[PDB]
Scaffold this active site. Sequence first.
Site, PDB file in Angstrom:
ATOM      1  N   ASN A   1       0.871  -1.177   0.000  1.00  0.00           N
ATOM      2  CA  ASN A   1       0.000   0.000   0.000  1.00  0.00           C
ATOM      3  C   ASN A   1       0.902   1.219   0.000  1.00  0.00           C
ATOM      4  OD1 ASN A   1      -1.494   2.354   0.689  1.00  0.00           O
ATOM      5  ND2 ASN A   1      -3.046   1.134   1.739  1.00  0.00           N
TER       6      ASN A   1
ATOM      7  N   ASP B   1       0.067   4.406  -0.508  1.00  0.00           N
ATOM      8  CA  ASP B   1      -0.549   5.577   0.113  1.00  0.00           C
ATOM      9  C   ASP B   1      -0.075   6.862  -0.558  1.00  0.00           C
ATOM     10  OD1 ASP B   1      -1.986   7.190   1.771  1.00  0.00           O
ATOM     11  OD2 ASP B   1      -1.585   5.933   3.549  1.00  0.00           O
TER      12      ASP B   1
ATOM     13  N   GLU C   1      -3.951   2.007  -2.901  1.00  0.00           N
ATOM     14  CA  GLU C   1      -4.061   3.408  -2.513  1.00  0.00           C
ATOM     15  C   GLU C   1      -3.073   4.262  -3.304  1.00  0.00           C
ATOM     16  OE1 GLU C   1      -3.938   4.052   1.717  1.00  0.00           O
ATOM     17  OE2 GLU C   1      -5.225   5.851   1.529  1.00  0.00           O
TER      18      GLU C   1
ATOM     19  N   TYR D   1      -7.840  -3.160  -2.438  1.00  0.00           N
ATOM     20  CA  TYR D   1      -7.760  -2.102  -1.452  1.00  0.00           C
ATOM     21  C   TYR D   1      -9.162  -2.007  -0.852  1.00  0.00           C
ATOM     22  CZ  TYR D   1      -7.147   2.520   0.600  1.00  0.00           C
ATOM     23  OH  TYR D   1      -7.117   3.604   1.443  1.00  0.00           O
TER      24      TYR D   1
ATOM     25  N   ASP E   1      -4.309  -4.676   0.847  1.00  0.00           N
ATOM     26  CA  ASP E   1      -4.640  -4.026   2.103  1.00  0.00           C
ATOM     27  C   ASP E   1      -6.080  -4.395   2.418  1.00  0.00           C
ATOM     28  OD1 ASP E   1      -4.687  -0.530   3.207  1.00  0.00           O
ATOM     29  OD2 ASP E   1      -5.255  -2.420   4.222  1.00  0.00           O
TER      30      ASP E   1
ATOM     31  N   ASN F   1      -7.620  -4.026   5.297  1.00  0.00           N
ATOM     32  CA  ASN F   1      -8.196  -3.068   6.249  1.00  0.00           C
ATOM     33  C   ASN F   1      -8.967  -3.771   7.364  1.00  0.00           C
ATOM     34  OD1 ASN F   1      -7.760  -0.073   6.126  1.00  0.00           O
ATOM     35  ND2 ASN F   1      -8.196  -0.378   3.954  1.00  0.00           N
TER      36      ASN F   1
ATOM     37  N   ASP G   1      -2.252  -6.003   5.883  1.00  0.00           N
ATOM     38  CA  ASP G   1      -1.902  -6.418   4.533  1.00  0.00           C
ATOM     39  C   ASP G   1      -1.578  -7.907   4.517  1.00  0.00           C
ATOM     40  OD1 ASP G   1      -1.652  -3.558   3.147  1.00  0.00           O
ATOM     41  OD2 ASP G   1      -0.597  -3.425   5.063  1.00  0.00           O
TER      42      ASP G   1
ATOM     43  N   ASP H   1       2.844   4.733   4.990  1.00  0.00           N
ATOM     44  CA  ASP H   1       2.534   4.240   6.338  1.00  0.00           C
ATOM     45  C   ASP H   1       2.193   2.751   6.361  1.00  0.00           C
ATOM     46  OD1 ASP H   1      -0.713   5.990   6.456  1.00  0.00           O
ATOM     47  OD2 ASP H   1       0.351   4.803   4.917  1.00  0.00           O
ATOM     48  N   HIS H   2       2.280   2.061   5.224  1.00  0.00           N
ATOM     49  CA  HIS H   2       2.364   0.607   5.189  1.00  0.00           C
ATOM     50  C   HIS H   2       3.744   0.198   4.698  1.00  0.00           C
ATOM     51  CE1 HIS H   2      -2.244  -0.119   4.939  1.00  0.00           C
ATOM     52  NE2 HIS H   2      -2.077   1.193   4.968  1.00  0.00           N
TER      53      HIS H   2
END
Length: 273
Positions: free
Chosen positions: A26, A28, A54, A126, A165, A167, A238, A263-264
């Site tokens: 991810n 981001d 993302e 995602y 990801d 989530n 993930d 941030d992943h």
Amino acid sequence: ALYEDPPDQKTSPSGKPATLKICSWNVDGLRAWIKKKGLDWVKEEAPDILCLQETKCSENKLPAELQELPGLSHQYWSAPSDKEGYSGVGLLSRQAPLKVSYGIGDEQEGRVIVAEFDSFVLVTAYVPNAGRGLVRLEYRQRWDEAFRKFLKGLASRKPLVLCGDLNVAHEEIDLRNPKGNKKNAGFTPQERQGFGELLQAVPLADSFRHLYPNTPYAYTFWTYMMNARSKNVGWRLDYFLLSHSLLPALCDSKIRSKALGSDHCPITLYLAL
């Protein structure tokens, strides 16, 4: 409580050498992740397939540096039609898949790409975040139901690999603060049951937890705030999920916790196919 991912097992239980390396990340923000040298890490990791989630970048604005990865020269992208600066996923592959499809057949959110290869079917996803203050938990729940169904009408043919990801932290073992989150997007009881139903219905196996059922503190996301990343205050959001038929090909499933850019962090699968 900081984690040190075990070394890469490139050989199967049956003693065969890994032939396929899939990496999922991810990013981001694809452009910002590129500026932070993401492609430099991927060049080194050198997977046969790379999945990105993302991306937050339209096809029109996809930096040309992506074409500078010739060992991952077949690239497929999916973005939301109306929404800009949101979601977006990508799948980059050394060989052309036999067929590539987008979405899960309702509709466009730019969250899912399906690629059928020789021996298996790869889905990257995602999954919608439930939202701060669970403002979108009710959209996540319908998505979960719809996704489960779409995937059932998919793994009937060839075995599945589902990465991305997702989530959701499945069990308490999957985040540092289970108790302070059982009502926060990613650890609500509905989401965690969605992930259990995902593993039941298709069915799939959590590749990492299969090989490391006891390992704690193994995370793939840390909020940018505080210094959660340095403090390893994080979540395992993930995954690589696999048909049971594939488990005998499963050499290892990694967490590349040192790789920066988002941030992943990336996760890497080794299969002996």
